[PDB]
């Protein structure tokens, strides 16, 4: 019932943080639904490469927000006690829900 949605611009940090939340729930010994991949947002930007005049010559950039949802079945007080700074990742933003 505890709902953690964890997102980052890099997928290795994403797998690390979801493994950490899975590890905390596994240490407390509760049933964990496996980490659900959620679809990646590909934000594409097309940017002219020349200061004055060019239209054909232009380069493309993508920001990719990888998304995971653990959807752990059971929260507990020991994980609440160990919750402080458990993610420890500047790359990942985590949103909690009840």
């Amino acid at each position: 019932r505890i709902r953690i949605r964890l997102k980052a611009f890099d997928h290795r940090l994403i797998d690390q943080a979801t493994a950490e939340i899975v590890e905390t729930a596994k240490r407390t010994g509760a049933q964990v639904r496996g980490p659900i991949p959620l679809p990646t947002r590909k934000e594409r930007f097309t940017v002219l490469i020349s200061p004055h005049v060019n239209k054909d010559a232009r380069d493309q950039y993508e920001i990719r927000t990888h998304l995971r949802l653990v959807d752990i079945v059971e929260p507990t007080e020991k994980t609440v006690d160990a919750l402080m700074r458990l993610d420890l990742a500047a790359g990942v933003d985590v949103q909690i829900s009840l």
């Binding site: 997102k7 980052a8 927000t65 990742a89 500047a90 790359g91 990942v92 933003d93």
Partner: protein, 206 residues
């Protein structure tokens, strides 16, 4: 003129990003401007300190800035006072609580920013451009890089017609995305004009 930027083309493959944080689209632009201002301040304050790379990580409560410096002692100061003052001013630029760490850069000539600003300072001091380029490539080959390319560009040796001279030692395989090439630029504000030095150092295939 027609070439890719090596850090950008290797940004997802080999070379790491300079700023690692997540902010939403509301705060992305304000964060990016704060990164630029923090980088600008500590660059201009610690240019004598041989700062090479500046890594700003925001855990979105705070800001953590790691400065990769060849000379750590001048940044740190005596008893941490200088780096504490830097942390305070970086805190008011960012608007959030701040942290600054110093990561030392061993093998200072092997770093691309440092060799470029060294050639720039010599060109400011009117040392010969050829002397600066040859010293750069020879010290890199002595320290053990597989290659180094140095480009000086513009108004060389106080000559009215601008020229571009490249001194190359070793291997700099830019097309290989596996290869780690550190590419950086510096700018010499000489009395006749601006001279741009662009350096590439190739260390290995990762």
């Amino acid at each position: 003129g027609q070439k890719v930027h090596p850090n950008g083309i290797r940004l997802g493959i080999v070379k790491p990003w300079n700023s690692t944080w997540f902010a939403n689209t509301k705060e992305f632009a304000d964060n990016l401007d704060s990164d630029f201002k923090v980088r600008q301040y500590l660059t201009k304050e610690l240019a004598k300190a041989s700062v090479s790379r500046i890594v700003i990580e925001r855990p979105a409560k705070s800001i953590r800035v790691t400065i990769h410096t060849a000379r750590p002692g001048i940044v740190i100061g005596k008893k941490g006072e200088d780096v504490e003052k830097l942390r305070k001013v970086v805190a008011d630029i960012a608007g959030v609580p701040a942290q600054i760490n110093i990561a030392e850069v061993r093998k200072p000539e092997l770093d691309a920013k440092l060799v470029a600003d060294s050639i720039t300072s010599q060109l400011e001091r009117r040392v010969m451009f050829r002397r600066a380029m040859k010293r750069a490539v020879q010290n890199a080959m002595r320290l053990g890089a597989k290659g180094i390319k140095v480009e000086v560009s513009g108004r060389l040796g106080g000559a009215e017609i601008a020229r571009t001279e490249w001194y190359r030692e070793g291997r700099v395989p830019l097309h290989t995305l596996r290869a780690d090439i550190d590419y950086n630029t510096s700018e010499a504000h000489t009395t006749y004009g601006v001279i741009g030095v662009k350096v590439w150092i190739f260390k290995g295939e990762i």
